[PDB]
Design an enzyme around this catalytic site. Sequence first.
Site, PDB file in Angstrom:
ATOM      1  N   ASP A  90      31.578   4.722   6.695  1.00 56.49           N
ATOM      2  CA  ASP A  90      30.209   4.166   6.639  1.00 56.49           C
ATOM      3  C   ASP A  90      29.272   4.162   7.705  1.00 56.49           C
ATOM      4  O   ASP A  90      29.410   3.511   8.654  1.00 56.49           O
ATOM      5  CB  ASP A  90      30.535   2.520   6.110  1.00 56.49           C
ATOM      6  CG  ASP A  90      29.211   2.015   5.773  1.00 56.49           C
ATOM      7  OD1 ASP A  90      28.110   2.467   5.586  1.00 56.49           O
ATOM      8  OD2 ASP A  90      29.494   0.739   5.629  1.00 56.49           O
ATOM      9  N   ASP A 136      22.783   6.142   5.042  1.00 55.50           N
ATOM     10  CA  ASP A 136      23.812   5.220   4.837  1.00 55.50           C
ATOM     11  C   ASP A 136      24.965   5.799   3.923  1.00 55.50           C
ATOM     12  O   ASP A 136      24.729   5.779   2.627  1.00 55.50           O
ATOM     13  CB  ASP A 136      23.227   3.892   4.430  1.00 55.50           C
ATOM     14  CG  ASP A 136      24.281   2.609   4.214  1.00 55.50           C
ATOM     15  OD1 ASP A 136      25.407   2.793   4.802  1.00 55.50           O
ATOM     16  OD2 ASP A 136      23.890   1.713   3.414  1.00 55.50           O
TER      17      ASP A 136
END
Length: 364
Positions: free
Chosen positions: A222, A35
């Site tokens: 992201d 992440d």
Amino acid sequence: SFVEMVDNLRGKSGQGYYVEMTVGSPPQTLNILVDTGSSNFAVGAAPHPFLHRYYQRQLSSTYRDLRKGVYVPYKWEGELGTDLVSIPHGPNVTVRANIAAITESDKFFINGSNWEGILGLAYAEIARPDDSLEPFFDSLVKQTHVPNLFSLQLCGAGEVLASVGGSMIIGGIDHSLYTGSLWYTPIRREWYYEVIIVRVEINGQDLKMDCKEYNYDKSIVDSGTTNLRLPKKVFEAAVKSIKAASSTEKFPDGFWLGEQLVCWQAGTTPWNIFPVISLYLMGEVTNQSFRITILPQQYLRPCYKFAISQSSTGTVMGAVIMEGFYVVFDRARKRIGFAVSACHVHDEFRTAAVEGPFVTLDCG
Ligand SMILES: Nc1cccc(Cn2c(-c3ccc(Oc4cncnc4)cc3)ccc2-c2ccccc2Cl)n1
């Protein structure tokens, strides 16, 4: 040898990419979501209906309690400590990194995703409880000779949710993972991997918005988000233009709202009626930029779901954007490089593209 990090990523479509990691001593194996949109190494450390494994601190001889709790509503909640961490299919090193042992969570873990924690690869600024909790990658670089850089090739897929694959190359760049030139956009600030989008086109057509709208209130890269998320005004312009381009054929606005699915059966999908989307990112040189161009193959994720959605937190270049490319998180040089991926999905008329430079005569 980066060869050994190739394909070290797996996941289910829409549920994120995870790398295998081990924590503690003896090594407790866990799948950990990669992440770039957060900064905590946070791992299930207590039973949960969606967890088939969890980190067991008491089983680890090298565990150290930081006697400090952490609470994250948005929830997840846990206790801080350190322990030895490795990535079996990553650099051949072991580092003592901070770990948020998650003891209670609400809508955090995902049913059937097959990961048990999150590897926040972003910067200390957005780490919880605060920025004194050194993120994993910082520890990794500080403790080892691993170069301050990592790159992500997310490949997507191409009954059960489709399985996806990819590579997280830690400490460098794998030239076999991409073709053509790597183009770099600066990291505007080291918290999220914040970047600047200066222009966006749908099938060559400029949305013609004040570029500030593209990064309102910010733009980030992201891996922890599935969709291309866009600021309200940009999303609406985007959808309008995409609807128009794919006017032949008519879809329910439930589809455009990304909650409903659309189906052809099968191999009949009219890709060619959906336009490409070009995001121009600020170049390393003031008045330059380069575009990354993605196909409907990326923003229609598998029967399909519209993987472009509205954001109240700025533009989010999620997996479906990164899946077109080999993305280099050059932390050492405060920049993110994009190159056409060796694995990006395309047909015999279009292809994802990274192209530059493009010039201009204040977009943050
Ligand atoms: N990039 C982002 C954006 C938002 C949040 C997070 C991390 N996070 C999550 C989270 C859980 C599962 C998840 O799974 C998916 C889902 N869809 C696609 N791929 C993977 C994605 C995110 C819950 C709470 C936080 C959090 C909040 C603040 C600080 C630290 C953290 Cl860990 N990462």
